[PDB]
Amino acid sequence: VSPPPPIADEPLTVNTGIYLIESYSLDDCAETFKVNAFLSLSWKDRRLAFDPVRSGVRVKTYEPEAIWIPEIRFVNVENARDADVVDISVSPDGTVQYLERFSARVLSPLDFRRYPFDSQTLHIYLIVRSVDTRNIVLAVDLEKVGKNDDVFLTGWDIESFTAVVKPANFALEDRLESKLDYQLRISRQYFSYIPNIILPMLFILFISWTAFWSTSYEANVTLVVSTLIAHIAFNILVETNLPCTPYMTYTGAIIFMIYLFYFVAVIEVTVQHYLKVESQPARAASITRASRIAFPVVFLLANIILAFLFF
Amino acid sequence: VSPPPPIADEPLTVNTGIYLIESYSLDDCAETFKVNAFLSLSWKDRRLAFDPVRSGVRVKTYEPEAIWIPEIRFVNVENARDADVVDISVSPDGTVQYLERFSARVLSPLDFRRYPFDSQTLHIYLIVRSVDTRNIVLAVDLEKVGKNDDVFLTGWDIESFTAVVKPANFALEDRLESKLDYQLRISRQYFSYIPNIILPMLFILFISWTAFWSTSYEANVTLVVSTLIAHIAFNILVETNLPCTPYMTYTGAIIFMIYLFYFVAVIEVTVQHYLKVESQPARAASITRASRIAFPVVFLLANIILAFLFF
Amino acid sequence: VSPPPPIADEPLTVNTGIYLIESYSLDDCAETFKVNAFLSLSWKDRRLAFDPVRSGVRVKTYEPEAIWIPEIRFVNVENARDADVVDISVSPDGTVQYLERFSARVLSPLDFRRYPFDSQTLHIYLIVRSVDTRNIVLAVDLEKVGKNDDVFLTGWDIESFTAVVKPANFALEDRLESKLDYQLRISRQYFSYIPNIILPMLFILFISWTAFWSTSYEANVTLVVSTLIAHIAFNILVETNLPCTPYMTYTGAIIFMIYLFYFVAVIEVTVQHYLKVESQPARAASITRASRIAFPVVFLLANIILAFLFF
Amino acid sequence: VSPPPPIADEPLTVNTGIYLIESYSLDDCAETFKVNAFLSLSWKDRRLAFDPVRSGVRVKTYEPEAIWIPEIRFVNVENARDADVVDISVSPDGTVQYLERFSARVLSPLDFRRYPFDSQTLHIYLIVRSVDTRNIVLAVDLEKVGKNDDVFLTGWDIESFTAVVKPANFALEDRLESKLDYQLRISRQYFSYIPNIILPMLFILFISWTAFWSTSYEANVTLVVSTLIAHIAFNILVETNLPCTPYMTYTGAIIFMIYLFYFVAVIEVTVQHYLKVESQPARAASITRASRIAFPVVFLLANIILAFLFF
Amino acid sequence: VSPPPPIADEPLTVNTGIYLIESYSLDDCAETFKVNAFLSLSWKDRRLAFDPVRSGVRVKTYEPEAIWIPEIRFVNVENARDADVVDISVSPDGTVQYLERFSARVLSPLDFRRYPFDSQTLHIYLIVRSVDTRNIVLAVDLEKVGKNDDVFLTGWDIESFTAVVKPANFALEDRLESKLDYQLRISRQYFSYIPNIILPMLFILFISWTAFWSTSYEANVTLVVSTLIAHIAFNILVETNLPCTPYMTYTGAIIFMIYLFYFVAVIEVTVQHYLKVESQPARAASITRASRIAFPVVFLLANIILAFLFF
Ligand SMILES: [Cl-]
Ligand SMILES: [Cl-]
Ligand SMILES: [Cl-]
Ligand SMILES: [Cl-]
Ligand SMILES: [Cl-]
Ligand code: NA
């Protein structure tokens, strides 16, 4: 089999559609997600045309091997789609209607800047390369683009599944490539992060501040160093669920800034003790009394600055 | 091969049955489980009918390629099933009796709200797409739906394996589809969670309460802080075995509430010390004496409420 | 090809044998193990019979596609067996000698009750479904059941590889199934657990008992709490290497009981301090002196009782 | 099919090109990376020559099985590449233009000496083995070597993708082999390591140096030991993300040297206390006062040297 | 196709050779490694013989299906090797020269006794089963056994790749099997273990010994207990990367013995405090002064002894 010939000099229009059946395994570190969907292809092949009245059969059904099917591939897939051909239907006029069910691991980058209050646009790029005979061009049949209502992605809210109707036509290795952009819009469910990471992390920090109502250097050293230790664990815990980035993330900024607070609390605790030993507890008392106010405030303002910069 | 033609205008009824041989790998974080089962299909194809007299055979065996087999797929599978054909038998009226052995990774959501005292309903959805020639409809042959007695799922009690007899017929990509719902009912074996997570977590909390029978600020700070850090370990330990949810979980609620108790115990420990230093240990003594009773009581009440809200 | 016809009304006897070449990957959590073995099949097909005198060839060699081979499957395999056929030999009387080399992931439950002093019986179930023409029955050719001397399973002692000679014949989906039980007997190599888990865990416990020869509450508090946290690590470390069970394990019981000892030691440490503060160190001295004997004695007695219950 | 015949005694030139579509999964520990690219191949087979007048078509399209294709393999791949032929075009003279889309896990060693400020040269080696009939030689068509603009590798900056135009021709197992070297130049994005590992590690170190402004042995022991323990945590965390090397890495050197600082701080803390107990706090005061300066200075000097040695 | 017939009653000699292209993934816990190599096979098949004069070619090239190829398998592989036939060449005297490129996961046990100063001999066992027609025997063509210079195994030094020239012939299920032993000799790169595990572990131990120059029970308790806690981490960290063995390893012995040192240091610290409280610090002073010497000496001696027992 060879491609259908052009009536006039026109490129072949392959109408495409992706219908999500299942979406799963959004790996933040790998910046990948798995998808299970229907891929629909429609093009016209005059060689396959027939008479409806004469033939009696409204539609003719073919096996993939029997007819010419355009070679459609995904740009951003990790491991090549396992495809199932569901049906091939030919109209009297020669309009072919192809439908396959596929599953693929899609590689699509993520913006972690606003984590865990981030939204993402996942991309699925369809591509076709032109043949020497004729040029192939992709189009979106919006009637055949969608998703099942039950499509869920653990820890995410699925906003929309749409296609950018206009293909990106470009030359690559001296042949035309027609690229289509399917978009899955999702927003992270930040709920869990509040009682699991955010609040426990604030409690340990407030506990460190009780050292501002104590004169016991030994108790203070324990309060500040221990609580400090809990933070490293939280800091570490998160890095593990995140890939290295060239920029700072929201949670990353909060976590880093909290380190400075522990460092300064240690300084205060050290200063207060030093003065007490130098028999000047009135200076020490002033610093401790100030810190009670300054820490919470500065900390408070700084977060406002951070949230402002990040959102 | 093409579908069997309708005698009158009727849709083709494909009788289905799933018999579980094995169930394994229930991944809580992935919300998936693996299954190994028999899939039985039965439909009438008059074209294959024969007379037992002239043939001398009560049944006829065919190779899959030789005859028309309805394209049955699973909706909620991750990695498309690997199938083995066990046997294809044709009765004299042309009644086909198909049997395959398959294995598949099924994606079915889980409700973690009552963890680890939760029960789940796992779903296996069978589907068939109608062809242009005729409509294909699924039915359940309850005689061919079951499970082996030895079917086990590690850390779970297998309640039942049943099918919702009435299919969900609907349109998708301008063709009708007949969807069937097979249900595997399971309940979590919470036993382990008691000596592994629950009890150790209560012991560490109760240990923090000995600070209510001590005047030593340094010992108390050590008592609370140390006990506190262990809570974090458990809190983390659990969450790593569980996915992010938009709602609170029973264990999650208990764990979060326990953080508040440590926070308040730190406050009491701080308050008691402050008063002792301000040369007013009679006030301090009252608060500490109240704490010995209030903490346990409030804890008992709050837990009651939580269990009430969750069950 | 169709099954060999019965001379009289007899079922077809397929003689089976499994010869282990390799055993590996015993996953405790998954309750699975991987196996690489020879599968031998032997049955009589009279249609294949010949003359040795005139043919000049004692044995005739066939390709799988050329002859009828019984469909033998494994009941308990996690995933698809790679199968490669080494040889098919036909004796003059028509006795077929099939030999394949396979590899499979077998799912077989484990009893963790006596961990790490447990022994297990791994099962490999062979099965054959009877055809409409004739009934197929499995048999064990003990001559062709064995294992290579070099077969090893990391962290386990391989006791025996035997077959239960009598098949389990039963009806399933209105046809006879013939099931065979191959058994791999193994016992865990508990050596490592002594210097890695058991002894370190006892040392930390004994270190907490030094608090019985100290009057320093702050010191005692530190001893007991610090030692305590290490136990959680061991407790935690261990449980991660295990699946959740509906029962208590030996190690699990020891670990849980040790928590009670820390809890009571904290109580004693608290009591001793309280009395010392209430200016009654003679009562405190009696309790501490009793504790020095009592803890070890009880601990020892408790351990004996448990061992008794578990073995 | 056999190789095309020489027209003089010349070896067959297979022109090659690799165009990266996707690069992902750079595993530092495994020293591997996954790639998804186009493999272009061009050779001349005069046996495929045709007159466009007779055939109708200016360019002929063949299926891989139909014609002779040079056996091109990758030297440094983990499992055999996943390949799909995009197109096979033949021009009238018999010039074949082969295009396949492949994905492979490439094993290429990494130099960790400058981690996390290291750059790497990833290699992809193409190879062809000569036949007894004629010798096959590889060449680079620079017009068909490149990468998509959107090619990204998480945590890395992609510098260049080039080919060493001159093949490495050599004898192996009494036949000629033509090897080509494709190079992917990348440099690590060290940003994250600063707020995640480097800075937290320095803060904890400086927290320990506050022991130089304290006379409390008990507080100092807590400061130095506690802070010390966190270092082990960071030290360990880092090791996990790196493989064993026969050399010392930049981060590894910093981490190791920091251990010495804790060891010496413990000595100072011990010395200071010993003198204080021996009723000679004036000597102790001198050492502590020196330490306040020497530690930071020495540390600083040492880092410059190492920084210097490594770069 | 059938095997080449014997001229006299001789067994068929299949000359073998393995040439390593790549070595990777040495999994210590799994006791496996992955290999990518050339497998060369050579045997005489007289039926394939020809005259160079008549034929006009001095070599004949066949496709695998066309001729009889001996069924060579690997004994110790996890899954059946991924093989691609590179070439099949026939000399005029019926000498067949087969070449395939394969990749396989080899299961070969490791001796951890001297870890991390251990050397290993990895085995690759080639095997052939004799047919009813004739007996097959393996031989090593040393000219075709080798490895690429660039072959590396992360964290290991590759010593040699050789073959035991004499096969192990034996009966298995009443057929002769010819087994060959290919050996890959490797020695572990212990470098990393010194600054990563060994030295940090000695530093924490030495820090615990500073308790011998302190009278502060509370300070001492903190020193020993804290440091002890670091030891568990190292002990735990190590055991995670190593399988359970029925014998002690070198590192395992050092780690275990160090536990005894902490246990005895706790006893000394307890004893010293007890005497101090009983108003007898002169006895306490003697024990502490002895400990300063006895601990280091004993420790030193014990390792010498151990080093001796292990090497
Ligand atoms: Cl694709
Ligand atoms: Cl499916
Ligand atoms: Cl099977
Ligand atoms: Cl390859
Ligand atoms: Cl093999
Ligand atoms: Na302390």
From Swiss-Prot, chains A, B, C, D, E:
Membrane topology designation: Multi-pass membrane protein
InterPro entries on file: GABAA/Glycine_rcpt (IPR006028), Neur_chan_lig-bd (IPR006202), Neur_chan_lig-bd_sf (IPR036734), Neur_channel (IPR006201), Neuro-gated_channel_TM_sf (IPR036719), Neuro_actylchol_rec (IPR038050)
Membrane-traversing stretches: 190-212, 216-240, 249-277, 281-311
Any matching Pfam family: Neur_chan_LBD
Organism listed in the record: Gloeobacter violaceus (strain ATCC 29082 / PCC 7421)
Annotated consequence of substituting S226A: Increases the binding affinity of TBA
Annotated GO CC locations: plasma membrane
Domain note: Consists of an N-terminal ligand-binding domain that encloses a wide aqueous vestibule and a transmembrane domain that forms a narrow channel.
Gene3D superfamilies reported for this sequence: Neurotransmitter-gated ion-channel ligand-binding domain, Neurotransmitter-gated ion-channel transmembrane domain
Function summary: Cationic channel with similar permeabilities for Na(+) and K(+), that is activated by an increase of the proton concentration on the extracellular side. Displays no permeability for chloride ions. Shows slow kinetics of activation, no desensitization and a single channel conductance of 8 pS. Might contribute to adaptation to external pH change.
Periplasmic side: 1-189, 241-248
Name of protein: Proton-gated ion channel
Subunit structure: Homopentamer.
Protein localization: Cell inner membrane
Activity regulation as described: Tetraethylammonium (TEA) and tetrabutylammonium (TBA) inhibit the proton-activated currents in a dose- and voltage-dependent manner in vitro, whereas the blocker of acid sensing ion channels, amiloride, has no effect. Channel current of GLIC can be inhibited by inhaled and intravenous general anesthetics at and below concentrations used clinically. Ion conduction is also inhibited by lidocaine and by divalent transition metal ions such as cadmium ions.
Record topological domains on the Cytoplasmic side: 213-215, 278-280
